[PDB]
Design an enzyme around this catalytic site. Sequence first.
Site, PDB file in Angstrom:
ATOM      1  CG  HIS F  49      -5.081   0.941  -9.835  1.00  0.00           C
ATOM      2  ND1 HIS F  49      -3.790   1.162  -9.402  1.00  0.00           N
ATOM      3  CD2 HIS F  49      -5.400  -0.317  -9.445  1.00  0.00           C
ATOM      4  CE1 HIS F  49      -3.349   0.082  -8.778  1.00  0.00           C
ATOM      5  NE2 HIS F  49      -4.306  -0.829  -8.789  1.00  0.00           N
ATOM      6  CB  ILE F  55      -0.615   2.975  -7.544  1.00  0.00           C
ATOM      7  CG1 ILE F  55      -0.362   3.854  -6.314  1.00  0.00           C
ATOM      8  CG2 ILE F  55       0.324   1.789  -7.526  1.00  0.00           C
ATOM      9  CD1 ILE F  55      -0.508   3.121  -4.991  1.00  0.00           C
ATOM     10  N   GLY F  58      -0.205  -3.281 -10.864  1.00  0.00           N
ATOM     11  CA  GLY F  58       0.802  -4.315 -10.994  1.00  0.00           C
ATOM     12  C   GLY F  58       0.520  -5.266 -12.149  1.00  0.00           C
ATOM     13  CB  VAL F  59      -2.589  -6.927 -13.513  1.00  0.00           C
ATOM     14  CG1 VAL F  59      -2.938  -7.754 -12.278  1.00  0.00           C
ATOM     15  CG2 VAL F  59      -3.474  -5.684 -13.637  1.00  0.00           C
ATOM     16  CD  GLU F  63      -1.107  -7.351 -21.637  1.00  0.00           C
ATOM     17  OE1 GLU F  63      -1.669  -8.230 -20.946  1.00  0.00           O
ATOM     18  OE2 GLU F  63      -1.010  -7.417 -22.887  1.00  0.00           O
TER      19      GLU F  63
END
EC number: 4.2.1.59
Lengths: 145, 146, 144, 142, 146, 146
Positions: F49, F55, F58-59, F63
């Site tokens: 990713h 990067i 975002g998830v 978390e």
Amino acid sequence: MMDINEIREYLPHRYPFLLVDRVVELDIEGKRIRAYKNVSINEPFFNGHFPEHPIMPGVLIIEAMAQAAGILGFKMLDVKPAGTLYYFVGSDKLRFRQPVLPGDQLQLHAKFISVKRSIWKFDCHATVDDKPVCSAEIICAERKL
Amino acid sequence: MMDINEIREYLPHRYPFLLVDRVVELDIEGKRIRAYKNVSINEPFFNGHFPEHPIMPGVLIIEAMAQAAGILGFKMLDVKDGTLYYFVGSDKLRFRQPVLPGDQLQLHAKFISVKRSIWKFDCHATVDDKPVCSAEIICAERKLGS
Amino acid sequence: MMDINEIREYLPHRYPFLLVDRVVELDIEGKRIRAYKNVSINEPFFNGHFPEHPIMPGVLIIEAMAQAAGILGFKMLDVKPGTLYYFVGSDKLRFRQPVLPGDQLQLHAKFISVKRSIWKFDCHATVDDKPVCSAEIICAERKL
Amino acid sequence: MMDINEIREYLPHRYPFLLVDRVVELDIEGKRIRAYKNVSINEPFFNGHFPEHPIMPGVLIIEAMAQAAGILGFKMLDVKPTLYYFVGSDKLRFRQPVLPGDQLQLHAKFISVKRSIWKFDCHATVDDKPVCSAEIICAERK
Amino acid sequence: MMDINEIREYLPHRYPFLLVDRVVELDIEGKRIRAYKNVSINEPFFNGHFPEHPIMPGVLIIEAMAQAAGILGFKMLDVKPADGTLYYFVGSDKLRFRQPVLPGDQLQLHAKFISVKRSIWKFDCHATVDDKPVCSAEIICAERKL
Amino acid sequence: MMDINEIREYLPHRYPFLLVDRVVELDIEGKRIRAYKNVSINEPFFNGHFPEHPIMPGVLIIEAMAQAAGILGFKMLDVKPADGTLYYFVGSDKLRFRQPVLPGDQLQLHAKFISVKRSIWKFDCHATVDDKPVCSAEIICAERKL
């Protein structure tokens, strides 16, 4: 001799940082140890060192030696650790010659030198097919994690 | 005689499934190959097979043998692209002693024949010259993507 | 049904070599088991088998069957294991079609015979009920 | 239907972060997609979430959904190698945990795009029971 | 002032052996560099060194410094090392570790240029966490190409 | 302050899903928490990713925020460590990302208790890099037995 399980009774190291696959000779009195680390392409660090050109890191060869020194330091005092670890505190002469490649059987040698209090000094040599590949005077400090 | 880089020119396999670390002898005239795989505790499958009892999966020994044969095949026809010898079978396969960290798995593959583009090889694996595994490998040429 | 944790009570295998994700049926009177393994591109072996062409290694398919066979063996005799069914050999092992990401690898193992510590199972693997692999697995029940 | 090789042509995501194993239906007419992700115990995230109790991270269910949406988006504008950056969501909910051996069904329905800000209506299910649902909002970039 | 992408233009290292996350200052006139490596529990080596007692391996700190040195090298001789060219770590005299580096620490890397007789380069390197001295050594690389 | 081991007494998360590298401030009276997660290129998710464009997902930031909230939850009620309890992430509102997190960044995690209805907790969460906003959302958890 010593297989991987015994080795693991002496070193707390685990994947992906256990760099001693076998100990062939424990010169109990000569205060020295002979062991090896099989170098295979199926190891996790190769992909990043380097893509298209696998070469076992030198620092990893160092780590391999210190680990062998540690085993030796314990067998010498005929003891079985508790956590207890020979912490790599420093080194003087440290050199590499030819690079270690996949398929090589990194031979590891460590000889007891001195020990001033808690500090230990070892004279280590790594070799592939008798040809020297690395050499350094490892310094460890018996500590407890 | 070929190292990991040459090996990777004939096998499409990559980490963590390249199980041939070196080819010591490739007798193309005799149609046979001799190579090996270094077994180290520092391999990714050991933590799972098994925790506290490292034992090289037998299926990986088979895999290492088929890859040894594969190199021989690719060499026999200068096959580079990437497509491989799709492992399709074996009539008899047997294991003797388990392989362990520290061992140097010796791989032997001897070309037998090829009918309908179906290859049969006679393979053996050994450690310290003691037999560890033997089996007749059947591969079938195919293009990756078909 | 057997969830992953029950499976881990019987099989000592762990990541990345636990290749049975669920046991769906356990026919003891008929000495057979039905279980499956989910194939996902998010498995460690796919990056190397092969780059840009993900195909589940045939050898791993065998591994999954041997693993399901073992669960059946223990189940047949009400054993609650440090015992392991070592894969000691195979006869007429064959692969029909490749297993791909997205597939649900169905595993079937049927008891053929046993002579002391040597067990022989009749195994099959299928995707969408289509034959993918078959073999007679030979295991040696031993102390791990 | 789209196999893994086609999916990897519309998503730049790669191991260990490609969370869509197959696209079963791609309705370009209805502007929506139906895909799934096979949950196996042999995935890298299970050992750390959690030892002894394998439970797929809710955040990866979110990511799987966003990724299915992303395939729809690219199909719609026929986009080859950019990215559909995940910028937010307003109402996101999880009903039950996803476990090993579950086939995570992923549903994405295109809602609208304005100023390059895409909004999708997403749902995830297992054995047809609801697992997660949220409104994914993306924005093109790189 | 280099980010990770620029860094990967000078070092051929990749996962899991790239230990320079960012170059905050590159003072060419001063033949010295300043960079850092974010230490996080979420790195592959912590599980093995050691279980329930995460401590960045000293050898990886040496490695981090040898990597920062290499970045300084190329920049000095104003080149675009786009060709697998690399500074092969060959040796080091006097090497010391003064305290363990733990997760959450930001490994501050410092490399000062010293000599360069033929192809053998020499660097005076220090590593520090919260400005407190962590490691120090003399890195000696030997520019070659993979 | 809380180091990684203390953090692992409260959170059952382990590699590769422990996303809190250090807790810097625990303000009980104010029911807030300040922690951070070091973002290093040497993490397992970057390769995927994305290749050549690292990067942080975002998830994962979400978390990381939920994990920090959990620690806050326990500290607030003087809950002794390994309780076998998990603040299960069950939902969110107003989730927004304002800019990507990159290798080298020190992701700052902020969590502020909002309210609790029996077992369902709600936290006001924010993430920042160099004090500039990066992420924000209302994290809803369900305190359950792992």
